[PDB]
Amino acid sequence: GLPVMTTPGSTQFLTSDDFQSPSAMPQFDVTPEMQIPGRVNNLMEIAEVDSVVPVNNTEDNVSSLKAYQIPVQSNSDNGKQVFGFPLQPGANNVLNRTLLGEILNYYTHWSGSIKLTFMFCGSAMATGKFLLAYSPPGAGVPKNRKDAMLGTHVIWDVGLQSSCVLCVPWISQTHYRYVVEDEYTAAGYVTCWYQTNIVVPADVQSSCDILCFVSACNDFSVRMLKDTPFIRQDTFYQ
Amino acid sequence: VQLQQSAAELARPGASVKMSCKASGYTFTTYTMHWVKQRPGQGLEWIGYINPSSRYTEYNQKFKDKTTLTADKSSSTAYMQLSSLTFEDSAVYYCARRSEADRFVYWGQGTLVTVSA
Amino acid sequence: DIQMTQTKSSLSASLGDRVTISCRASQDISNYLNWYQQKPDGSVKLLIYYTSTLHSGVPSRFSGSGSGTDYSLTINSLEQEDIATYFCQQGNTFPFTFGGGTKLEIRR
Amino acid sequence: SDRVRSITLGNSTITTQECANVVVGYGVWPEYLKDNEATAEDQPTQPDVATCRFYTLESVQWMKNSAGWWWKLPDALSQMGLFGQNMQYHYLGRTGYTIHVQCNASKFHQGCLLVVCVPEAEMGCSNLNNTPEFSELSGGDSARMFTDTQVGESNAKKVQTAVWNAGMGVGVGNLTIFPHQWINLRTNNSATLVMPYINSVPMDNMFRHNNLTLMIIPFVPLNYSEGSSPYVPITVTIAPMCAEYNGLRLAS
Amino acid sequence: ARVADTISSRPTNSESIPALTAAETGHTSQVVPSDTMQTRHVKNYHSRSESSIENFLCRSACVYYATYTNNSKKGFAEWVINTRQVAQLRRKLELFTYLRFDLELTFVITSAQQPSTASSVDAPVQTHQIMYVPPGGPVPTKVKDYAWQTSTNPSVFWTEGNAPPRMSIPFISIGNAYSCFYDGWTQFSRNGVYGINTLNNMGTLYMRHVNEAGQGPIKSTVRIYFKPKHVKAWVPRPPRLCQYEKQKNVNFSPIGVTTSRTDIITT
Amino acid sequence: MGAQVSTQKTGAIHYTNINYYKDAASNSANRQDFTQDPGKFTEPVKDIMVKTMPALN
């Protein structure tokens, strides 16, 4: 007859508790383990793999393979804009459904750097130079090459190595940022501009394409697990 | 969460009508949109559907040569055009949103189509 | 196609009575049946999205049964708001074929 | 140089003069079954020169309006020499592969392929109530092709071959989580993948389970000016690695 | 599990190129922001503890709920155990191809009064029975059946008003891991069924009232909650894009990859 | 015989845990096994390529 006293919070079902419970099948012998290749220990190495991002959503390319192709041609003026999108990996519909944006929609906060690899899938006799800028917020989106050269940028020269990594840094006031669309924790804009033209020889197609990849750096982190908004149900599956 | 259709229409035999079913409360480009015809002396009858994301329509074998289903992304509506109207095309037309494979959970209120002189 | 036939087409029972509406198919549809209810002002809603699995928001007077070719729908206590038209719909083969109507009324 | 390879397996050799590096599995190399993990009690057969060699499948043409191709490859080698004969007389079997996709073009063409090797690819049917049949899922050493449109639901047992959903109902851009390479016609010329045995059981019957699927999807389509060669073929050679079999019986 | 911190950088003019790589090799670039710009030396204290496999999956989620009526013949529920009738637990488990975990069941049983006709009903507290039948055992066909003796079948009894019941089930399987996908058939002749239903033999779960129908019918409802413990996961996989349609297979309707914007330069 | 799993989750303190049951499939969740190996998904490449060197020699 030990005298105890039950506290508030008794006989409740909290869905995230770590308690012990009596087993239904005592002395059960499990099947022994096996070295299966590809064991994942953390979800932050699924978000560190490159995945193609659909930059070209123009209301009829989303149900096609044209969403991933960025059109690049041989121009007749200087400093034209290639693409542009704000940096929201959980709310903006460009980076929403990638391999990184589908893990960020299970969590609430995120923090870290983001790599952006571009591959030039054109002809072997084509040349060109591009400017890959990133502007922190406070001003608007840059509208000229002169306004975009004042931020964090890199000048990509195509050649033998057909890829260039623009790694955006972690510039913020807070330690974390919200996954959902917020004005207080905005992150900025990512643009692309022609540095020089695309010069091709004769009998070479002047319209080339560019693929873009996106992953996370080695200092990425997430917090406060929640439910995803991309799945839905009305009745049971049967 | 509801769907709202157009008003009751009236057309000459041989003319064409265009109904609509505006969806609200959910993401329009996720679920397919179906159209059911109900003559007043018979049961329900299926016509076809349209995938609003890829703009792919598939009709029944009877209503292929008359009906045409379109949709748009901005106003979140789904249209349907009936052509070469005859006297048996006077019925009530519903719009439904297909849930898991074989059940429709949300319906419209239906428009009344009649042909006369 | 699969011909979904209801030979009833009209039913009459008093208040507080147990009714039964049956729908018979052409071939075996393997428990893929749905029951709908059409109110007299034009509104249609889903009642039972399986052979016997009730939809959310439907009162517990409704219950389904059946297996194979012959099926059923049962209301154990008829109320005043249950006077409507009931359809059966199969979901096994293309296209979706609906059954005939079944209107309910008062006995005397 | 880092652009030249040479793979020797049995009595067959594959050389290449411009290429990227090779991708090996999930970090592991194919090896035999150890005594800790074996469950069968009879002695296996390890021929290892008659079955571990390069088998060349049929070629496909890369058109301008091409959507993609796919093989299964325990089934693609079911009629290939002595690998397909040990598969019939034995009940069990495990193996790893090495895959070499090769497609050459000049300096005046452009394009980009995604060579991805996925495990356990359940494909979806066109009609939502049925499952696809065997002849639509895999052909013996002949490619099954995706489409750039959606197969209608009036077809009873046919695979849904919308290419942007990759046939499995996932985003086609997220297929880079599996072991993969790209064939960029600007730089690359051939892709090489080495795959171990990936399964939840130590051995499996090779005739009712296809534990791999090789998909080739053109992201940037082929384009050339008038005058260049319009016929560009794609050839796939697969070689088993560390194959062994148990359970000898009649022919089936 | 602390994350890596950035180091100090200097202005360089050299022949080393960290930004230029080759993505055709199937190898993601390992650059950090201290190679493309000047950075200061910060030290991170951020941890990756919440993105682990154990913290991601070990949370309770409902899988099914079934009802049964007291004053009714053949009023009792059954459920073949599978984890693919819901939308949210099915999507989390299908990020990996093979899993291996222990379970932790929890049942939430409610009740509701039905419109009887006897004046001044008064019922005592109710007792429920939840029997688990392994694949191959004899099943009950009515309520007052002999099969509810539970000679070897584990079952649980629960009186209304207490804490909910909770068991724990080890890794029950024939193979070395649970399989979420199976590209193959059951028959050796490659006919009939095809998909994941070939490996699903976890068993059946039966529910009933113990008390007899005194004066008024009572309709109960039991919700079932899964909680994976000691989770190991292999072979990651891209997440599901299209909506689920059926339970036994992976059939789908095609959909766009994202939602569309009006231009390529619009923000 | 109580286990000294003491190190709690704290930002930048002990606790005690005893197992009462006879089955190892009835304990609490692990929740503190922090292991990382991203090199099998990000670098599945036979010949090791350095970051500063060009990738295609």
d(CA A172, CA A101): 20
Q: Which of C43, C46, C101 sits opposite B105 (nearest CB)?
A: C46
Cis status, amide bond into E124, omega within 30 of 0: no
Q: Which of D248, D218, D203, D198 is nearest to D64 (CA)?
A: D218
Phi, psi of A103 (to 5 degrees): -90, -35
Structural domain total, chain B? 1
Structural domain total, chain F? 1
Domain holding B46, by residue range, is: 3-115
d(CA E110, CA A52): 48
List of chain D residues whose C-beta atoms are within 8 Å of the C-beta of residue C32: 129
Q: By CA distance, what is F51's nearest residue in E? A: E18
Residue E243 and residue B31: Cβ atoms within 8 Å?
yes
The three-class DSSP label of residue B11 is strand
Q: Could you tell me which chains touch chain A, where touching means 3 or more CB pairs under 8 A?
A: B, C, D, E, F
d(CA A131, CA A114): 18
d(CA A202, CA A198): 13
d(CA D177, CA D160): 22
Domain-wise residue ranges, chain E = 1-267
The DSSP bridge pattern shows strands C103-105 and C10-12 to be parallel
Angle A167-A184-A43 (CA atoms, 0-180°, nearest 5)? Answer: 50
Which residues between 17 and 36 in chain B have a beta carbon less than 8 angstroms from any beta carbon of chain E? 27, 29-32
d(CA E63, CA A238): 13
Q: Which residues pair with A26 in a beta bridge?
A: none
Min Cα distance C97 → chain B (Å) is 7
Domain-wise residue ranges, chain C = 10-105
Domain holding D147, by residue range, is: 5-248
* Strand boundaries in A46-196, DSSP class E: 51-52, 70-72, 81-86, 109-111, 114-121, 129-135, 152-157, 163-168, 177-178, 189-194
Q: Which of A23, A41, A42 sits opposite F25 (nearest CB)?
A: A23
Domain holding F44, by residue range, is: 1-57
Residue B104: Cβ within 10 Å count: 22
Tell me, what DSSP letter sits at residue A230?
S
Residue E115 and residue C77: Cβ atoms within 8 Å?
yes
Write C67-70 long-range contacts (CB < 8 A, 24+): C67/C31, C68/C28, C69/C24, C69/C25, C69/C27, C69/C28, C69/C29, C70/C22, C70/C24
Instruction: Label residue A151 exposed, middle or buried (CB < 10 Å: 0-12, 13-18, 19+).
Output: middle
List of chain E residues whose C-beta atoms are within 8 Å of the C-beta of residue C54: 67
DSSP B23-58: E-SS-TTTS-EEEEEE-TTS-EEEEEEEETTTTEEE
Phi, psi of B57 (to 5 degrees): -110, 145
List of chain D residues whose C-beta atoms are within 8 Å of the C-beta of residue A162: 184, 186-187
Domain holding A51, by residue range, is: 1-238
Residue B51: Cβ within 10 Å count: 21
Min Cα distance D39 → chain B (Å) is 42
Q: Are A210 and A108 in contact (CB under 8 A)?
A: no
d(CA E105, CA E117): 38
Which residues between 34 and 63 in chain C have a beta carbon less than 8 angstroms from any beta carbon of chain B? 34, 42-46, 49, 55
Residue the block writes with tokens 């890369």: D62
Which residues between 209 and 238 in chain A have a beta carbon less than 8 angstroms from any beta carbon of chain C? 235-236, 238
The three-class DSSP label of residue A206 is coil
Which residues between 31 and 60 in chain B have a beta carbon less than 8 angstroms from any beta carbon of chain A? 53-55
Q: Which of B89, B78, B93, B88 is nearest to B37 (CA)?
A: B93
Tokens matching residue A170: 């972690």
Instruction: Kindly state which CATH superfamily the domain C10-105 is placed in.
Output: Immunoglobulins (2.60.40.10)
* CATH code where residue D100 lies: 2.60.120.20
Experimental method: cryo-EM
* CATH code where residue B95 lies: 2.60.40.10
The three-class DSSP label of residue D172 is helix
